[PDB]
Design a protein around this ligand. Structure first.
Ligand SMILES: [Zn+2]
Ligand SMILES: [Zn+2]
Lengths: 164, 164
């Protein structure tokens, strides 16, 4: 019955194994960090991931989301800016549906929903700058009411930003 | 055993009574909103309030914090920018201890701890712009582990930004 909080800045740790680097000799610590814990939380997804993020430029988090899409996880992404090789651009090129705001600041959430059961939500924008340098919190909660209410909010915004 | 979430933008509603306007005839709806719920959560404080906020310019939230200081609530405020009549300036003039970051973006939390028992934390910066126009979430949680861990984070940052 998961209820955790990750505080940032993250310790810089190796994530090559975790992110299936193609093909450890590197010089980083090979222990867990706030980033590695966030990556693992995302990578435990077996069926769906909703992402509702003001900003998303972290290549480590971008890669994890790609890996999920490749695994057949149903990935849906809402961001504030259209970004138009950013991460949103790379995700979009891989076939992941991304919908978006007016890049005016209005879509300011920073949350993700894993398999309609775990809520990941924080102050943290998903950028290497913020991860490595800012004081931030991210909550990881397996809570049915919070998941339900955040899912409902997602689906309203999703339908609202429908292109067609 | 409180576990709530407030979604923004807030409905514009009257808060004169709630904020003890000195001395209702106004034209706003006199019902509850996300802002009014956030104000009430803060105003239930009877002994302490820690505030850890990237930005704080909302005059309605500034007034509530003043009222708490006047009630004898022990108020301590951490923000990212020194602000040097902003709200932080007004709070500081009233005797409330405020400590701060390098206005570089680094102190990016948006949380508050009421009476060492209720955690209020969100994506929301406490500005009228964001409250009235942005999609945001604020969680209000009476959870002992989250309160403990967020309090520990507060006190580390507090001691770190000690002027003396
Ligand atoms: Zn390594
Ligand atoms: Zn009124």
């Amino acid at each position: 019955p998961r209820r955790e909080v990750l505080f940032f800045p993250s310790q810089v740790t190796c994530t090559e194994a975790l992110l299936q680097a193609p093909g450890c000799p590197c010089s980083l610590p090979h222990s867990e960090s706030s980033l590695s814990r966030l990556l693992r939380a995302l990578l435990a997804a077996r069926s769906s991931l909703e992402l509702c993020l003001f900003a998303f430029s972290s290549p480590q988090l971008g890669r994890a989301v790609q890996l999920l899409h490749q695994r057949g996880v149903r990935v849906r992404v809402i961001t504030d800016c259209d970004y138009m090789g950013s991460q949103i651009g790379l995700l979009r090129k891989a076939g992941i549906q991304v919908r978006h705001d007016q890049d005016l600041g209005y879509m300011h959430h920073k949350f993700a929903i894993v398999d309609k059961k775990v809520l990941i939500t924080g102050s943290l924008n998903w950028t290497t700058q913020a991860i490595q340098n800012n004081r931030e919190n991210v909550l990881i909660m397996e809570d049915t009411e919070y998941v339900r209410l955040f899912l409902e909010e997602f689906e309203r915004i999703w339908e609202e930003f429908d292109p067609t």
